[PDB]
Amino acid sequence: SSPAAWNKEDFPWSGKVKDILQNVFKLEKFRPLQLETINVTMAGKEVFLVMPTGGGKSLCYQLPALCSDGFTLVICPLISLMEDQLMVLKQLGISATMLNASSSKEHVKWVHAEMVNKNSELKLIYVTPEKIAKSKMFMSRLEKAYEARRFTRIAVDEVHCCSQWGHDFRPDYKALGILKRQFPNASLIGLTATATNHVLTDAQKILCIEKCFTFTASFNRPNLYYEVRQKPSNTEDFIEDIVKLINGRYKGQSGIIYCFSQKDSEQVTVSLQNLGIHAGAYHANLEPEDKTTVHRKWSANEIQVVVATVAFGMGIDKPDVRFVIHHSMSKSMENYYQESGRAGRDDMKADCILYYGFGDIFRISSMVVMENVGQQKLYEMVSYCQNISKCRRVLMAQHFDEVWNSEACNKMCDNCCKDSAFERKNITEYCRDLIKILKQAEELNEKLTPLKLIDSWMGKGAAKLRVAGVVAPTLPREDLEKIIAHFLIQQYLKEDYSFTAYATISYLKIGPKANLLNNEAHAITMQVTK
Amino acid sequence: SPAAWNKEDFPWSGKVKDILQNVFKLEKFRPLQLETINVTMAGKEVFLVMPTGGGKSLCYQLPALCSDGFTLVICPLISLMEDQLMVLKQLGISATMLNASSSKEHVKWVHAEMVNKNSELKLIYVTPEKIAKSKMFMSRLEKAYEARRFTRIAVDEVHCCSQWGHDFRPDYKALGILKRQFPNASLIGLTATATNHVLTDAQKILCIEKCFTFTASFNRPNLYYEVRQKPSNTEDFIEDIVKLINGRYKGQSGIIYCFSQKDSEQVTVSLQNLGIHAGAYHANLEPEDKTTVHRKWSANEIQVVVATVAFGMGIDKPDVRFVIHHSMSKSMENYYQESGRAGRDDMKADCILYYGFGDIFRISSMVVMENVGQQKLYEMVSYCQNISKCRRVLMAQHFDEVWNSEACNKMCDNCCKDSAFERKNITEYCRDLIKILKQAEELNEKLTPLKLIDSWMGKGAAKLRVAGVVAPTLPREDLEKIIAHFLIQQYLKEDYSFTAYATISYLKIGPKANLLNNEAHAITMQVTKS
DNA sequence: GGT
DNA sequence: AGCGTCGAGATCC
DNA sequence: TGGATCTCGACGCTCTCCCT
DNA sequence: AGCGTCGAGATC
DNA sequence: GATCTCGACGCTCTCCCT
Ligand SMILES: [Zn+2]
Ligand SMILES: [Zn+2]
């Protein structure tokens, strides 16, 4: 677990290695962890690498495949993912191919031939797992190649699928223990961007390995600027704001906007189009043509902006994305990190801006009602939006359990650039008033949505639901909203779901921690600007 | 502990005794039945672990008749549901089910009877996607719960909730929604197979606390257990089977289990040619064929079914008098569940298993991609090699149960034997085999098990013999048993090879062999005295 | 098809 | 089901 | 007996991520 | 590929 | 007169929806 120990260049192979980097791949130096990994593989050992998408993983196997003689075998879960790499490879003059569930009796026959063939130019073969489990023909081929010593290294992609917990399970993966058992003299390397330590140590068993190196890279992206803003109440106003940025500071530049639904995705698109902006829509119910065309024009810069759901994500590698804007919040902290992380892959400065709105809490809540920890992960994301003083990088590192040193931000988030001071406001009596309202409602046999509770507080809405003697304070509507959100994640209040013919809806009720207000000396405070 | 729950002095006890004798036509309770029913009527949560045929379903079916209105049942397979409706119908009790393939007329009537205030309906079966994906179905349960027409829930195959379940079905991960939305109903979980790990997992997922756990014993006092030598010649094997079936079993129903689909059909043809009434069963017949066979066997128009593991689920014939194993099972858990289909009426019945050398290697190759396949096979081989321990004692070592050793009462073959024993020294035979294997590798040749026994015995191809070795004077079946011994103790080992149409086993020198370098090392095996 |  | 709009009538200054 | 503002039914429109 | 059968061709 | 050794020639090639 110590990479630095492996940070030299006095190994025999060091020469051809430096040679191949600059001459074949056209590069000057190494990004982090790359060198320490390559050394370990050339020393003939076993290693796992954990690093974020776009960090430089594939080079770690693609390169040593060129220092020995003959091919390297690569196992990959999806067809699209394989095609991406062959293209890059083809563009540098390197022969490699892939077999698959849908190849031709001719192609299939040509690969079988090139493996045994001791004079072939092949360097890399990509396959799927069912290929290892369900093909005696293919396995008998590997056997012969291994015995002539045409094949000495193996790489496994998405290695977190071995173990049950990985949250992506693919059964075919459990079979892969057969690799070290039948070819013990070859070295193995596993790759992934997402792994608990329990999950890793498990798969080391499934693959029948011992012993094992484990290198881990850091989450941090020094060139990205992080900001949260208030979402405007009126849709026509919100669309204007976004236009001022696109024709303003980002004019001429490429970006992405992320939405909540398929319908939101289309309606935003129509609106930018109607004001001369060059934009296109992307989601899972579109024809495969539409998808492929939109993705093509964006890469060629004939299109400035893609407006998308989470469907637009897997396998994106464009270097010059200058902005990423969030039209609604994400459903969890892990999802936001991976979505925003698509900006600035060229290492140059880029911006990440998120719009926060009260009504989105409840839209996402109902959508995730059957996930066992759905509501918990949502409330974590809500906490991050409510905060007006801690560094954004500090709040993220609490989620990933990295060891953060406080002042490494350098004025690259919104809270670190603020000039203000703060104080804690006492809001205990507001909580006692809301509970009066809820309590009257139940005697009357009525249920309240969030909208109806804010209305009664403010003295508006249907009259029977008001309570004599309560006075709603003199603040803007957005401040009242932020206060209610506070009581909710602290559990003084709670959600109560109902099932109807076409929808799941949320109501508000008295929560479990409301018993604390029995001490008449108990106090609830929230932070504000002076 | 259940002990505390074994009475009849609670307010319900009367109607309960009433309903057992008058509605279900029964005298007294089988083990654990009473203690479970009490706990459910006391409004609590409980898990029940008990073998198939033990009396589980009665534990929910009955209390469904003491309250008012229906009980909801969740079940993974359509066939399993149909079995139970048939029984309930014959009793005079109303019930129904809902499916992926139901008519719109039927679906309507059901939604109607759930809310309907005077419904005769008593039990309702559904699958787990009805709960996870139907919006209309959930809104129906909601109304029923509020009128108090529905207060108990049972979940079948409860072990599927979990990843370790060895039977996983993903829709199960949505069932936490039941206690969350209906906190006043009681829940009961059912299963025949569970680690204490698997159970604690499912009690989280279902969002429960706290929880009773009752466990029944594996033991079946009426079954007689035996192991016999399988004859080399196949014309000879068919004869003994017939001596039994015309002899002690004449006129009695039984089952015979086979290794392959092809074995299944030959054996059948051989019995028919000698006047036995027999039929074949495996996954590769038409849906129609299957049913017509299962039907004639139940009506006693057919004496014997010859089958693969495909023939198991749904089986409930009370009067199965014999179960014979044509080849061994692949694991101890499989044998237990297969043989356990005999004697469901509590009357005496027989279980006989035929052991053969060549079957070890047939099974080995078939399970090559399961990560613990070879391990589980060698456990089953150990049990066949033993000539002195009680069969019940060897089984209880596998289930981690608390057996006291004289409880068998002369109901297995080893407990009826009259013999005495001694430890034969076989160290020099091991040294000789290794010589043979060592010569073979110099010559660049690989040996199957058949080829090794031949060279030992002085037969086979001549270049593979070793000068100075003398094959003992013993029968072949004894030589086979000795080689099996060195294999599980790991003086030898298996080495697999992949070919165009087959996976095959070879034998090679194994690890524990190094120990033959001390001149003080001794290997012994147990035998009967002259 | 949601008193 | 929830919520936005339109109009008639009943309350305010 | 003027001009603004509250209150309440009747009515029509709308109803949620990703192949894992 | 492994294993079984058959008949010419050298040694019991 | 009855057992031994070697090519050549032909046939066969595996459990359940989970
Ligand atoms: Zn900062
Ligand atoms: Zn016994």
Structure tokens belonging to residue A37: 């990994």
CB within 8 Å of B506: residues ≥ 6 apart:
B446, B447, B448, B494, B495, B496, B497
Q: Is B354 helix (H, G, I), strand (E, B) or coil?
A: strand
Helices (H), A59-106: 59-62, 79-90
- DSSP secondary structure letters along A303-354: -SEEEE-TTS-TT---TT--EEEESS--SSHHHHHHHHTTS-TTSS-EEEEE
Rounded to a whole number of angstroms, the distance between the first and last alpha carbons of chain B is: 52
Whole-Å CA distances, B283 to B77, B278, B331: 17, 17, 21
Q: How distant is C1' of G11 from CA of B505, in Å?
A: 21
Alpha carbon A473 to its chain centroid, in Å, reads: 40
Alpha-carbon separation of residue B53 from B49, B187, B191, B333, B396 (angstroms) = 12, 22, 12, 16, 20
Q: Which residues are within 8 A (CB) of B256 and not within 5 positions of it... i.e. 6 or more apart?
A: B241, B267, B304, B305, B306, B307, B323, B324, B325, B326
Query: What's the burial of A235, exposed, middle or buried (CB within 10 Å: 0-12/13-18/19+)?
Result: exposed
Domains of chain A listed by start with CATH number: 1-220 (3.40.50.300), 221-420 (3.40.50.300), 421-530 (1.10.10.10)
Rounded CA-CA distance A79/A99 in Å is 10
How many Å lie between the alpha carbon of A179 and the closest alpha carbon of chain B? 10
Task: State the residue for tokens 């006693």.
Answer: B300
- What tokens appear for B121 in the block? 């309906």
Cα A130 to Cα A77, A85, A101, A146, B375: the distances in Å are 9, 20, 9, 20, 24
Task: Give the closest of A136, A208, A372 to B205, CB-based.
Answer: A372
Q: From ligand 2's centre to the CA of B226, what distance in Å?
A: 10
Coil, strand or helix at B141: helix
Contacts of B136 in chain A (CB under 8 A): 501
How far apart CA B157 and CA A211 sit, in angstroms, is: 39
Q: Determine the Cα angle at B101 with ends B99 and B102, to 5°.
A: 75
Assess contact for A157 and A74: CB atoms under 8 A.
yes
Closest nt to A362 (CA→C1')?
E16
Experimental approach: X-ray
| Sign of the CA dihedral with A138 first, then A144, A150, and A154 last | positive
Compute how many other C-beta atoms are within 10 angstroms of the C-beta atom of residue A197: 10
Among chain B, residues having any CB pair with chain A shorter than 8 Å are 132, 135-136, 138-139, 142, 163-164, 173-174, 176-177, 181, 205, 207, 368-369, 371, 496-503
C-alpha–C-alpha distance, residues A514 and B272, integer Å: 78
Q: How far apart are CA A233 and CA B490, in angstroms?
A: 75
Closest CA to A367 of A340, A335, A396: A335
Residue B150: partners with Cβ closer than 8 Å, 6 or more residues away: B69, B70, B71, B72, B114, B141, B144, B185
Among A328, A390, A365, residue whose Cα is nearest residue A485? A365
Residues B153 and B95: beta-carbon distance below 8 Å? no
**Nearest residue in A to B177, CA atom:** A370
**3-state DSSP: chain B helix, strand, coil percent, rounded to 5?**
45, 15, 40
CB contact at 8 A, A504 and A497: yes
Tokens, residue A178: 């057969």
Cβ atoms within 10 A of the Cβ of A404, count? 19
Flag if B371 and A500 touch (Cβ within 8 Å).
Answer: no
Are the CB atoms for B40 and B129 separated by under 8 Å? no
Residue from B107, B91, B108 nearest B99 by CA: B107
- What backbone torsions phi and psi does residue B225 show, to the nearest 5 degrees? -105, 130
Tokens of B335: 């044998």
Q: How far apart, in whole angstroms, are the C-alpha atoms of residue B186 and residue B63?
A: 12
- Residue A397 buriedness (CB in 10 A; 0-12 / 13-18 / 19+): middle
Please report, to the nearest 10 degrees, the dihedral formed by the alpha carbons of residues A504, A508, A513, A519 taken in order: -170
> Any residues with CB less than 8 A from the CB of A292 and at least 6 apart, and which?
none
Distances (CA, A) of B116 to B13, B109, B147, B197: 30, 10, 10, 42
**DSSP strand pairing (B46-49 vs B212-215):** parallel
Question: Residue B97 and residue B93: Cα distance in Å, rounded?
Answer: 14
B527: which residues sit within 8 A by CB, 6+ positions away? Answer: B421, B422, B423, B424
Tokens representing residue A310 in the block: 């989470």
Distance CA A243, CA A250 (A): 10
Protein CB footprint (7 Å) on chain C nucleotides: 1-3
Measured distance CA(B167)–CA(B159) in Å, rounded: 8
Strands (E), B340-445: 349-355, 421-425
Residue A42's SS3 state is: helix
Edge to edge, the sheet with strand A96-98 lists: A96-98, A124-127, A71-75, A151-156, A187-192, A47-50, A213-216
Q: Are B15 and B63 in contact (CB under 8 A)?
A: no
* Chain B span 499-518 residues with beta carbon within 7 Å of strand C: none
The Cα-based distances of A211 to A2, A5, A151, A191 in angstroms read 15, 18, 22, 17
> CA-CA distances (angstroms) from residue B16 to B32, B88, B151?
15, 18, 18
CA-wise closest residue to A309 among A249, A256, A232, A248: A256
d(CA A38, CA A40): 5
- Closest chain B residue to A371, measured at CA: B174
The alpha-carbon gap from B495 to the nearest alpha carbon of chain A, in Å, equals 9
Residue at minimal CA–C1' distance from E17?
A310
- Contacts of residue B138 in chain A, CB cutoff 8 Å? 499
Measured distance CA(B142)–CA(A499) in Å, rounded:
7
| CA dihedral of residues A176, A177, A181, A183 (deg, nearest 10) | 30
Residue type, B379: E
Local structure of B78: helix, strand or coil: helix
Token pair 């008593």 in the structure block, residue:
B122
- CA-to-CA distance for A372 and B175, rounded, in angstroms? 9
Tokens of A367: 């959508």
The SS3 of residue B378 is: helix
B14, two tokens: 């009367």
Distance CA(B140)–CA(A139), nearest Å, equals 54
Query: Which DSSP string do the residues of B458-481 spell out, in sequence order?
Result: T-S-GGG--TT----SS-HHHHHH
Which candidate in A147, A372, A376 is best for mutational testing of the B interface (most B CBs within 10 A)? Answer: A372
Classify residue A356 by burial, with Cβ atoms within 10 Å: 0-12, 13-18, 19+: buried
Whole-angstrom Cα distance, residue B337 to residue B217? Answer: 14
- Selection from A204, A215, A216 nearest residue A176 by Cα: A204
Structure tokens at A341: 């992380």
What is the C-alpha separation between A70 and A153, in angstroms, rounded? Answer: 10
Nearest nucleotide relative to B502: CA against C1': G13
Resolution in angstroms comes to 2.9
Nearest to residue B77, comparing CAs of B145, B146, B127, B141?
Answer: B127
What are phi and psi for residue B213, nearest 5 degrees?
-140, 100
Q: Residue B370: exposed, middle, or buried by beta-carbon count in 10 A (0-12, 13-18, 19+)?
A: middle
Structure tokens at B67: 């309250």
Structure tokens at A143: 């056997």
How far is it, in rounded angstroms, from Cα A409 to Cα A394?
A: 9
| Tokens 């979990």 found at | B162
CA dihedral B357, B359, B363, B364 (to 10 degrees): 20
Would you give the distance in Å from CA B23 to the centre of its chain? 32
Nearest to residue B34, comparing CAs of B214, B192, B209, B185? B214
Q: Whole-angstrom Cα distance, residue B105 to residue B114?
A: 15
Q: Do B503 and A136 touch (CB under 8 A)?
A: yes
Q: Which residue has the tokens 């002076």?
A: A530
Could you tell me if residue B328 is left (phi over 0), alpha (psi between -120 and 50 degrees) or otherwise beta?
beta
Only one residue has tokens 């005496």, namely B348
- Any idea what DSSP says for residue B222? T
* Bond preceding residue A211 cis, omega within 30 of 0: yes
B359 close to B227: Cβ distance less than 8 angstroms: no
Tokens describing residue A230:
């208030």
Q: What dihedral angle (degrees, nearest 10) is formed by the CA atoms of B189, B191, B193, B195?
A: 10
CA terminus-to-terminus distance, chain A = 48
Amino acid at A85: Q
d(CA A471, CA A465): 14
Select from B18, B59, B69 the least CA-distant residue to B39.
Answer: B59
Backbone angles phi, psi at A426, to 5 degrees: -85, 120
The string over B398-411, giving b where at least 16 C-beta atoms fall within 10 Å of a residue's C-beta and e elsewhere, is eeeeebeeeebeeb
Question: Per-residue DSSP letters for A273-295?
Answer: HTTT--EEEE-TTS-HHHHHHHH
Residue with tokens 């006492």: A426
φ/ψ bin of A70: left (φ > 0), alpha (ψ from -120 to 50), beta (otherwise): left
CA angle A523, A525, A526 (to 5 degrees): 165
Contact A34, A47 (CB under 8 A): no
CA of A293 to the centre of ligand 1 (A): 39
Report the alpha-carbon distance of residue A353 to residue A332 in Å, rounded: 16
Q: Other C-beta atoms within 10 Å of B345: how many?
A: 13
Element (H, E) at A50: strand A47-50
Question: Residue A133: closest CA among chain B residues belongs to which residue?
Answer: B369
Q: Return the ∠ at Cα B43 (arms to B38 and B49), rounded to 5°.
A: 60
Q: Determine the length of chain B.
A: 530
The three-state secondary structure class of B312 is coil
